[PDB]
């Protein structure tokens, strides 16, 4: 029992949150946990709000989980999403680079092309691909935003500072950090490619399948593999940039209500998980894709006691993030 203040980013998430609140009220008893919705403009405002005791929980992509851990925020991961199936849950996913068929360029020929990113600092959309191109970037590589802006001939990198790095919002003027920007996130980054604004979209292996139902529409796209070849989109297991940890819900280190968070989500998945209810779905919405949780998730797993972001993310991934930040070639 008691209320978990979920931090919703912008209108669409706010709408799904309110429906989430209402549906749980109808199934949960008076003595069960409940949801209240707190709307903010960006994930970064949700991170501050939780630290300031204005909200309690928010789901973040793993690259943002690192940032949330840093002082003075010190949030910790408490519940993880899992993908795949309930039968063989995967606590990771694949970062891929999607391009259109016959566009004629490999991964070593990206300079001067136009890029669509899910958002600044996110695993698949940013950390992995920029991490892989880092030394191909021209000096000076600090700040990163500027070297990236000079390598591609225009991008959409949501959450980046368009005032300071205008080329980063060339494909999505303003670099809006929420679903109000139609090119934000996995599906937004894919739309940026499909619409012809960009030449490459840095997304996850499931993105295209979530967006194109026909195999014949999907045959018009391919993946860039690290060996400078291209493969079809079904072949992501042998043509991907990296494997990355799942998105996770974070909470405060003190008075964080981690117990209630797990309690609420565990019940939520039981009533409203994949194919559970005709009334409401935790992992999909008529209002948008990946709102509050990713549409590709199948459920949740509780993170082990007192695990910090660094341990959760793993040495490798943490090393990569660090090396992007200072990083020496
Ligand atoms: Fe992600």
From Swiss-Prot:
Annotated disulfide bonds: 7-46, 17-37, 116-192, 135-329, 156-172, 159-177, 169-175, 225-239
Chain positions found as Dimethylated arginine: 21
Domain Transferrin-like per the UniProt entry, residue ranges: 4-326
Lineage top rank: taxon: Eukaryota
Binding residue positions for hydrogencarbonate 1: 118, 122, 124-125
Entry's localization field: Secreted
Glycosylated residues in this chain: 30
Tissue: Expressed by the liver and secreted in plasma.
Effect ascribed to mutating residue 298 to R: In allele TF*CHI
UniProt-annotated binding residues for Fe(3+) 1: 61, 93, 186, 247
Subunit structure and binding partners: Monomer. Part of a complex composed of SLC40A1/ferroportin, TF/transferrin and HEPH/hephaestin that transfers iron from cells to transferrin. (Microbial infection) Binds to Neisseria transferrin-binding protein A (tbpA or tbp1). Forms a large complex with TbpA and TbpB.
Protein family according to the UniProt entry: Belongs to the transferrin family.
Description of its domains: Has a bilobed structure, each lobe binds a single Fe(3+) ion. Does not always bind 2 Fe(3+) ions.
Function: Transferrins are iron binding transport proteins which can bind two Fe(3+) ions in association with the binding of an anion, usually bicarbonate. It is responsible for the transport of iron from sites of absorption and heme degradation to those of storage and utilization. Serum transferrin may also have a further role in stimulating cell proliferation. (Microbial infection) Serves as an iron source for Neisseria species, which capture the protein and extract its iron for their own use.
Disease involvement: Atransferrinemia: A rare autosomal recessive disorder characterized by abnormal synthesis of transferrin leading to iron overload and microcytic hypochromic anemia.
Protein name as it appears in the record: Serotransferrin
Organism whose genome encodes this protein: Homo sapiens (Human)
Full protein segment contained here: 22 to 350 of 698
